[PDB]
Amino acid sequence: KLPPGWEKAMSRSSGRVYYFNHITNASQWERPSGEPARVRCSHLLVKHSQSRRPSSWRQEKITRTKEEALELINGYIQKIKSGEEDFESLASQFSDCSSAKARGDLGAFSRGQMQKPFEDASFALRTGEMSGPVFTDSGIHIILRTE
Template sequence: TLAPDSTLVRVVHARMASDLPKGWEKRISRSTGEPYYLNTLTKESQWEPPKEPASTGTSTKDQVWCSHLLVKHCESRRPSSWRQENITRTKKEALALIKGYREQIVSGKATFEELASQYSDCSSAKRKGDLGTFGRGAMQKPFEDAAFALSVGELSEPVYTESGIHLILRTA
């Protein structure tokens, strides 16, 4: 038998996990040798393969899971990012970029994840814009209000905060 930490087991585990909805891991039971599925948010497990993204089990009124694409401008509270040390674009130019990205996503020319990875001025770009779950009070108020108003799978209109202009995608 293979050790649980062997390279082959890790590679197989990674391949199996990629087919699962967000927030789930496939694991093998030590006692039965059968696969089971772990909700990485709640640490609860189940035998049946999940069909929906993991949730915290709490009311969606309490927590949301979102991704975002941030475009900073010269009036942002910190006009600097991993992409550009000194951001000089105007708020109007930032809005034009955000509207263009939204159009590409809505029209199907690009995915949210592709654009967030390439163009977001937030370090979450390395996670395709994924911010994970958060509750009320964790984000700037305009961002929080927009995120909690979205339905799962819905993309926001441009949202203005002190950080810049955002597109928010509610993922769970």
């Protein structure tokens, strides 16, 4: 019996089975196996032209499309997963959130405080686990649960 949130899938390019989480948008090859008052997370945000506030410390006027933002997110996830780059380094350089200055750290929080897709992903992640692309009214997030 798989844990809730998780489903079995089959690659497409290779035919090998993998597991996908529809709350975190994480995917992995191994069987996942398996809630607290509070969690601590970091994130990397890529905004797009339909973000609630299409502006950030990186760019006064953010004009990229949502599709372009998802491509950027997917590229950062690839480099993090390969070890070519660290999550903290990419967040500091490229997150459209002012938390970039703290390597993406948002600190600890409870349910009720964050936007719902962000909250649900954060609480479904295990400690140390990274999400896939998570969509909110702010943009597209990579979320790292640190505690």
